[PDB]
Amino acid sequence: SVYDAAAQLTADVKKDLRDSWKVIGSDKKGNGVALATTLFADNQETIGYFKRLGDVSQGMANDKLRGHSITLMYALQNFIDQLDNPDDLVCVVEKFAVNHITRKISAAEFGKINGPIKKVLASKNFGDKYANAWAKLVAVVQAAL
Amino acid sequence: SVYDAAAQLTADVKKDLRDSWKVIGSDKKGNGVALATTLFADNQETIGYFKRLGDVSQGMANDKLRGHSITLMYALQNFIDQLDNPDDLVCVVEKFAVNHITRKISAAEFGKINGPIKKVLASKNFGDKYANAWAKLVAVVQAAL
Ligand code: HEM
Ligand code: HEM
């Protein structure tokens, strides 16, 4: 199933993911925080999962939130690095899903991250072409939830 | 405390961490698996915490072990990347400590990774000077457990 979702990651999709990540991943703290705060802004209900982070309205200045946002970017870094080897991509995605499954985060709930990603990409001038490529990567993760 | 331990990362310690990581981090899968397998071999008592991974002796052939090993290296990548900013290093270490605290991994238990790190470093011609620098970084995590 995850192997099948990974099949949608064509040469063109992997190329756009890599090119866009070259920029997005160059500032993990700034964009990581951008992603997290955008998620909470567009889907306030997702905040229910982050009680531990405390006052998320503080954004960047919130040490726990900042700590989570930076760390989040390294999971994406991991995924991008494994793109050329489906066997490694799959084992890394399934490993990643373990804790999110335990948190009872469904594929549908996880899919809510697509909006914030599209926005973060757009702030760096990466159009729909790139947003669609990223949604396909997220779909691989969704297949594991 | 974690804030006092982070202050122990002096100029040269950070430099040695970077120079050695430049090589060790070049092959996250190979070195990540070597690190994990060495831990289980030298400290079989720690295998109990990794029941979900299955037969850990299969090494590279064990998909779950390979997934965990690769992912492990990205946490180290994170720490190295935050060396410039103590505030970020700390929030990233505290974030990392959460799940390990939940598994009841004590500071003394975590410290068992020092052996495997020393050996992997040694396999790449990096001596005690470097093993000691890494022990200091590990001490930062131990302070948060
Ligand atoms: C592309 C999107 C995402 C990435 C790359 C990502 C990455 C991560 C990483 C690396 C961690 C730390 C390791 C762990 O505990 O699993 C984490 C923690 C967590 N994630 Fe995800 N995640 C994503 C989306 C989501 C979404 C959509 C939710 C829920 C609506 C979610 C909820 C959580 C929670 C609650 C934690 C624990 C936070 C804490 O207490 O520090 N994640 N995630
Ligand atoms: C250099 C040291 C280490 C690093 C960088 C590291 C890294 C990680 C990462 C990134 C994860 C995935 C996220 C999470 O679930 O928290 C993890 C999982 C885990 N770690 Fe650590 N860890 C280290 C040492 C240890 C040690 C020494 C133990 C215990 C003796 C330990 C026990 C665990 C366990 C049981 C898991 C879950 C494995 C699974 O079910 O997939 N870790 N660690």
Curated annotation (Swiss-Prot), chains A, B:
Give the CDD domains listed for this entry.
Mb-like (cd01040)
Q: Binding positions for heme b? A: 100
Is Oxidoreductase one of the keywords?
no
An MF annotation (GO) of this entry: identical protein binding
Query: Where found, per UniProt?
Result: Cytoplasm
Q: What is its main location?
A: cytoplasm
Any one Gene Ontology cellular component term annotated for this protein: cytoplasm
Q: Which Gene3D superfamilies match?
A: Globins
How does the record describe its quaternary structure?
A: Homodimer.
- State the name under which the record lists this protein: Globin-1
> Which organism is this protein's natural source?
Anadara inaequivalvis (Inequivalve ark)
Q: What is the lineage of its organism?
A: Eukaryota, Metazoa, Spiralia, Lophotrochozoa, Mollusca
